[PDB]
């Protein structure tokens, strides 16, 4: 979708939140990105993808 502007610092945030326990604001941007770096290489799921 070439969204060079929907800076992803976005998705990670929500993600973590949805599994309460983690104090989101109280966790840096770093780790977060690295988190994407790994997610990227992950296969979607037939449902989702389809």
Partner 1 sequence: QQFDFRNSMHMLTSNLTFTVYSDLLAFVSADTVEPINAVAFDNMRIMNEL
The two structure tokens encoding residue 13:
């945030």
Nearer to partner 1, 9 or 17 (CB): 9
Nearest CA to 15 out of 38, 5, 1 is that of 38
Cβ neighbours around 30 below 10 Å, total:
8
40 binds partner 1 (CB under 8 A): no
- In the block, residue with structure tokens 């929907």: 6
Asked if 8 is part of the footprint of partner 1 (rule: CB under 8 A), the reply reads yes
39 part of the interface to partner 1, by CB under 8 A: no
**Residues in contact with partner 1, total (CB under 8 A)?**
6
Q: Which residues bind partner 1 (CB under 8 A)?
A: 4-5, 7-9, 33
């Amino acid at each position: 979708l070439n969204l060079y502007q929907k800076k992803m610092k976005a998705i990670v945030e929500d993600f973590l939140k949805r599994l309460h326990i983690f104090d989101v604001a109280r966790v840096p941007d770093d780790q977060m990105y690295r988190l994407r770096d790994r997610l990227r290489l992950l296969p979607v799921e037939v449902r989702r993808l389809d």
